[PDB]
Amino acid sequence: SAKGRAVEIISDIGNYVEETGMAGFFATIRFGLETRYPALALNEFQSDL
RNA sequence: UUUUUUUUUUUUUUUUUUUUUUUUUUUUUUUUUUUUUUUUUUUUUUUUUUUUUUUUUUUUUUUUUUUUUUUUUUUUUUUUUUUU
């Protein structure tokens, strides 16, 4: 549907609001899991994976 | 969050050549001449029964062992702090 000025501002703010308070998990995903490093498969990370 | 750039400027008709000139009948050879019946051998002559052996004599029950003896709850950690 069409978005008014208030709704557009609210959605733009919610862009920042999303995934708040969970920086540890998403940082773990993005950095440790993605960006595949030869040090990942090291037999002390399999349970964490 | 965002901070640049993002019209155009040339060329682009044509000019040659492009009929033909030779040759292109024929001339040999092309019947036949030998040989072509037959003459040996071609029955048979040994051997060809048989002569051993062929029952049996051992052994053949059994003698062990065969319950059990431990251990077997628990004692950590486990929200969040950036940017966008």
Side-chain angles (χ1 to χ4, degrees), chain A residues 10-42:
Chain A
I10 286 171
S11 40
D12 201 276
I13 289 165
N15 273 353
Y16 301 132
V17 174
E18 287 185 42
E19 311 168 10
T20 190
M22 283 175 33
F25 167 64
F26 279 131
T28 298
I29 300 315
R30 149 76 176 287
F31 290 108
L33 190 81
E34 272 172 41
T35 75
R36 301 175 296 281
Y37 279 154
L40 213 52
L42 179 80

Side-chain angles (χ1 to χ4, degrees), chain A residues 2-14:
Chain A
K3 290 196 174 192
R5 198 165 305 110
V7 163
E8 294 277 53
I9 286 200
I10 286 171
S11 40
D12 201 276
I13 289 165

Side-chain angles (χ1 to χ4, degrees), chain A residues 28 31-33 37-49:
Chain A
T28 298
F31 290 108
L33 190 81
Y37 279 154
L40 213 52
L42 179 80
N43 275 345
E44 305 119 334
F45 288 155
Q46 306 281 0
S47 46
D48 282 23
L49 294 153

